Amino acid sequence: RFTTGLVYDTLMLKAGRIQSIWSRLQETGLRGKCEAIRGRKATLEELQTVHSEAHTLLYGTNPDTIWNEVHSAGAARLAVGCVVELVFKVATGELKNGFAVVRPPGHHAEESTPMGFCYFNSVAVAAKLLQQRLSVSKILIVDWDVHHGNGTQQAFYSDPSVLYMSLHRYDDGNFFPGSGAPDEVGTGPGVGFNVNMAFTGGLDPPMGDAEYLAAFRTVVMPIASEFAPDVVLVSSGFDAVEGHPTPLGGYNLSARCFGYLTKQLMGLAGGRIVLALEGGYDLTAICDASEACVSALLGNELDPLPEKVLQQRPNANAVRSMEKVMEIHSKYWRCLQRTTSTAGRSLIEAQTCE
Ligand SMILES: O=C(NO)c1ccc(C(=O)N2CCn3c(-c4ccccc4)cnc3C2)s1
Ligand SMILES: [K+]
Ligand SMILES: [K+]
Numbered sequence: 281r282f283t284t285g286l287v288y289d290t291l292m293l294k295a296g297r298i299q300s301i302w303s304r305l306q307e308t309g310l311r312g313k314c315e316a317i318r319g320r321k322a323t324l325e326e327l328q329t330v331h332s333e334a335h336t337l338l339y340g341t342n343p344d345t346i347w348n349e350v351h352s353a354g355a356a357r358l359a360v361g362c363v364v365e366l367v368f369k370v371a372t373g374e375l376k377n378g379f380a381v382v383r384p385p386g387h388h389a390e391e392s393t394p395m396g397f398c399y400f401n402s403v404a405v406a407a408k409l410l411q412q413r414l415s416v417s418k419i420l421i422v423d424w425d426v427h428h429g430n431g432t433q434q435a436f437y438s439d440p441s442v443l444y445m446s447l448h449r450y451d452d453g454n455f456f457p458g459s460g461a462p463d464e465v466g467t468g469p470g471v472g473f474n475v476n477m478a479f480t481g482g483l484d485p486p487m488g489d490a491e492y493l494a495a496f497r498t499v500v501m502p503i504a505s506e507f508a509p510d511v512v513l514v515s516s517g518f519d520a521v522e523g524h525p526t527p528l529g530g531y532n533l534s535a536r537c538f539g540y541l542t543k544q545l546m547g548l549a550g551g552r553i554v555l556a557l558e559g560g561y562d563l564t565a566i567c568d569a570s571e572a573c574v575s576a577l578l579g580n581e582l583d584p585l586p587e588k589v590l591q592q593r594p595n596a597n598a599v600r601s602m603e604k605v606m607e608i609h610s611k612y613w614r615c616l617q618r619t620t621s622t623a624g625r626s627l628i629e630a631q632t633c634e
């Protein structure tokens with residue numbers, strides 16, 4: 281069946297996050313309509329596309345204490361394999377789109393550094409193989425986890441074939457992990473092809489749906505469409521959703537909204553989209569968003585957004601964060617060179633003017 285795939289495996293387990301998510305997906309019936317595929321460990325060679333051999337050898341090998349982390353490393357290896365496996369099946373046609381219910385997160389682990397609960401950058405190794413083994417010419421990586429995807433930025437900071445974009449809380453380098461200034465735009469041949477949609481201004485107020493929805497309207501989608509990729513890999517973290525406190529979270533997106541965001545990202549690349557779980561720790565929130573994202577992947581009719589949110593103009597701290605990022609990347613993209621700024625308008629308004 282040519283439909284929305286999933287990837288699960290209970291050998292990734294220490295109810296937990298991915299277990300709850302998977303449960304929701306069953307009970308809601310979305311799991312039925314999807315094609316659950318088989319996973320595998322990532323190969324040492326596969327992991328070395330992104331990481332160093334020294335790092336691979338240390339953490340890749342099978343040899344409330346020290347052995348906790350060892351299993352989490354063993355899980356992370358399997359995570360990369362699942363994410364590799366789904367991505368290839370969607371990319372080659374076998375499936376329409378996907379969603380990897382995998383843990384731990386990955387987008388933090390750097391070349392030879394395990395940080396932020398992350399051992400191996402799943403979404404990255406996936407992208408690396410797409411290039412090498414399927415000669416894919418353009419890969420879009422949207423990373424909507426609340427945090428900056430420092431691993432993923434580094435992986436492709438010189439390759440203009442992989443457009444990396446990241447919506448995150450930045451606060452002028454006063455948040456985890458600290459990287460991800462909008463000023464960072466790539467390097468060498470890959471200048472212009474790294475876009476940090478970096479929110480500055482703290483929680484006054486907290487960034488919400490309208491703020492992110494604006495950000496898509498004005499930055500993400502314009503650049504992505506122009507760029508026009510063959511495969512979309514989303515580092516789909518749900519720590520932006522409501523119910524993650526100030527420090528290990530901060531913002532208040534509805535889960536509902538992430539469906540809309542999936543729905544929009546499906547516009548690109550023939551719908552060749554795959555989402556992969558990163559952050560998001562509140563069990564209701566991540567179950568909600570997972571429900572919404574997969575529903576949208578199956579092309580189910582979506583629950584309309586509250587009139588309120590559709591009518592709400594984005595907060596100043598956002599509008600200011602958008603204009604700075606837009607300004608910078610107006611140097612490298614035509615859809616930012618033509619126009620005057622409209623990042624202060626609500627959705628309904630922006631559409632009232634098409
Ligand atoms: O969501 C994530 N990855 O997907 C995160 C990775 C790392 C995160 C982070 O901000 N950390 C800083 C806070 N922290 C702690 C804390 C330790 C004491 C008090 C508050 C936090 C332990 N580990 C971390 C990692 S969030
Ligand atoms: K890049
Ligand atoms: K991000």
Ligand SMILES: [Zn+2]
Pocket residue numbers: 425426427517519558559560
């Ligand atoms: Zn996170």
